[PDB]
A paper describes a structure:
A total of 228,461 particle images extracted from 5,962 cryo-EM micrographs were analyzed. They were separated into two classes in the 2D class averages, with them showing either 35- or 34-fold rotational symmetry on the S-ring. Because the MS-ring in the native flagellar motor is thought to comprise 34 FliF subunits, it is inferred that the 34-fold rotational symmetry structure reflects the native S-ring structure, whereas the 35-fold rotational symmetry structure is an artificial structure induced by the overexpression of FliFG fusion proteins alone. Consequently, we built the atomic model of the S-ring part (RBM3–β-collar) at 3.23 and 3.33 Å resolutions from the maps of both classes after C35 and C34 rotational symmetry corrections, respectively. The monomeric structures in the S-ring part from the 35- and 34-mer structures are almost identical (RMSD = 0.286 Å). Our S-ring structures are composed of 34 or 35 molecules of the FliFG fusion protein. Their diameters differ: the outer and inner diameters are about 26.0 nm and 9.6 nm, respectively, in the 35-mer ring, and about 25.2 nm and 9.4 nm, respectively, in the 34-mer ring. In our two S-ring structures, the 34-mer structure should reflect the native S-ring structure, since the in situ MS-ring is a 34-mer of FliF. We compared the Vibrio S-ring FliF 34-mer structure with three previously reported Salmonella S-ring FliF 34-mer structures where a notable difference is the tilt angle of the RBM3 domain. When measuring the α1 helix angle from the side-view of the ring, the RBM3 outer part is tilted downwards by 8° in the Vibrio S-ring, whereas it is tilted upwards by 6° or 8° or is nearly horizontal in the Salmonella S-ring. When comparing the β2/β5 sheet angles, they all exhibited a similar angle (55°) when viewed from the outside of the ring, whereas the angle is smallest in the Vibrio S-ring (58°) compared with the Salmonella S-ring (64°–68°) when viewed from the side. When focusing on the subunit interface of the RBM3 during ring formation, interaction was facilitated by two sites: an electrostatic interaction between E270 and K276 and a hydrophobic interaction between A399, V429, and L447 in the Vibrio S-ring.
Numbering used by the authors:
A (entry chain 2), B (entry chain 1), C (entry chain 3), D (entry chain 4), E (entry chain 5), F (entry chain 6): 255 to 327, 367 to 402, 418 to 452
The structure:
């Protein structure tokens, strides 16, 4: 029960560790050893979702049987059968999708252009996405 | 029964410990050894939620059988059958989701800008989220 | 359960590693050792989708049986049967399709034409596709 | 489950390797050793599609039984049966079809005619096809 | 599953190898060693198609039974049976048909007539067919 | 499955080899050693076709039973039975029929009459047939 849950926790940590390497592999040759520091956080969910969809197309009907009666003298009778396009889809979702991620970078003292360029580099280095509400902050402060 | 519950408690502590490392890895090189102190708290729940949804689309009907009678002289009769889009979803929730989290940081004596910058760094260092009603306080006081 | 999921994670890393070789095999002879740095990221999904389609062609009907009555004096009666073209398709999707990919390249200090040419080379070196919302950034910054 | 999927990945790499030989066998004697560089990418899918078609020909009917009544005095009655041409087709698709392919070639420094001729040679050397949205770029840049 | 698929790949390579010999057996005695280079590509499919056709001839009917009534005074009645020509065909397609093929030939430096003659020779040497959208390019470029 | 298919490939090669001997047995004593070169290609199919035909002769009917009534006063009634000629044919097609064939011959340097005569000889030497869209080209070029 709770034995497996702890394992899940460890997995999250692993993800963070991976990120903590990648940012280390890019900022080190450009900024320098001891002139930067950063940390990351990854939050995920472990739900279990299944979906079954069964759709129809009402705009394309096909007739199979038809009966009509038009007895004037005004008796009018009609009986028709139809066949429709059916689509069935069955989907199972993954377990462990990343929900949110936060990255913070502090640089020892910079102009606006340099910070913007470093942020642009980190955009591809990390993979920031605005759809998931991700967070990425880069700034320069005085060390001590 | 109660043997497993205690384990859950330990898990919470582990989470706090993790945070107590991350804040230590960022504030130490910028502020300095012995010039800061902080503690965290994490509160979670261990419920068990299952959901089953079965939705329909009323705006897209598809006809299958149709019978009509229009006997004037004004007898009018109609009988129709319909087919609708059906969606079935089954979801199971996780056990151990984080509900609230509190972070407090005290700095030995600072200007407003420095405190704001440190708070901004901690925002990404911790992962503060306003949706869950999280709490983060950073301030400077005189030590003794 | 969770034992296999971790394996999936490793697979993603492998993909990134492959890319980290290819960019190394092209930029090295043109730019030079120690004058560039780059990192990549690949995000995928592990869903399980099955589809079953059953289509009809309403514009091409074929008659099988026909009965008519035209008793004037105005009794009119008709009864027809039809046969239609039926197409049945069953599809199963893959597991592990690439969703998004980000590439970032920084070059030590360049004119606009050189950067454009390097980007064009990397376009075929990596395989950037705008349909998936892929990201590729190449820029030049001052190293330290 | 995931053990076989990795194998699929390896297969893709093999394809690329093959291409990386063919371009090496053509450009080497014409351009020269150390005056060119190139890389390729191949993306495929591993779906499983089955199709069953059952077509009819409505323009060519054949009568089998016919009954008629033409009682004047105007009773008119008709009843006919028909036989139609039926075609049944069952198809199974392959697994591992190539979807897209990208080729990029850089030549150390050229006139437009020479680049056009090299592109024309590579057209048959690789097998570029516009139907699949393939990509082939050849250009000349200054090396370092 | 995937073990046999790889074998299919090898088969394709074999085809190319065969072509790479035939062009070598014709161009070598006429052009000379070291004055030409060429490569080929063959793309095939591995589907599985089955067909069943059941055709009729409506223009040639044969009567079997006939009943008529011609009671004047105007009662007219007729009932006829027919026999028709039936043809049944069952076909199974091959696996591994060649879809497209590309040939590219470069000759070290030529007049238009010589290139046209070499192309004409290669037409029969390879078997170029316009129905399948085959590609054959022969040109002369300056070597280095 | 695929083991036998490869064998089929080998068979095709054998056919070509046979042709490569026959042209060698005719052109050698008339043209001379080292004054000619040629190659052939044979493309076949490996389908499986079965046919069943069931034909009738409507122009030759034979009466078996006949009933007539001619009650004047104008009641007219007739009922006849017929017997027809039936032909049943069952056919099974071969596997490995030759579809197309290409022959190309180059002669070291000729007048039009000599080339026409050599083409006429090769017509019977090979067996060129225009029904299958066969290809045969004979020409003279300068060797090197």
């Amino acid at each position: 029960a709770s034995a497996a849950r702890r394992k899940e926790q460890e997995l999250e940590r692993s993800q963070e560790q991976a990120l903590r390497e990648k940012i280390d592999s890019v900022l080190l040759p450009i900024l320098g050893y001891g002139n930067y520091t950063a940390q990351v956080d990854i939050q995920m969910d472990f739900s279990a979702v299944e979906q079954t969809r069964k759709r129809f197309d009402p705009n394309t009907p096909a007739t199979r049987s038809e009966y009509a009666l038009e007895d004037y003298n005004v008796r009018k009778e009609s009986t028709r059968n139809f066949e429709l396009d059916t689509t069935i889809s069955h989907e199972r979702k993954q377990t462990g999708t990343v929900a949110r991620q936060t990255v913070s970078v502090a640089i020892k003292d910079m102009s606006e252009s340099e910070i913007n360029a470093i942020r642009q580099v980190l955009i591809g280095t990390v993979g920031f996405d605005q759809g998931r509400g991700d967070l990425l902050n880069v700034l320069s402060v005085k060390f001590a």
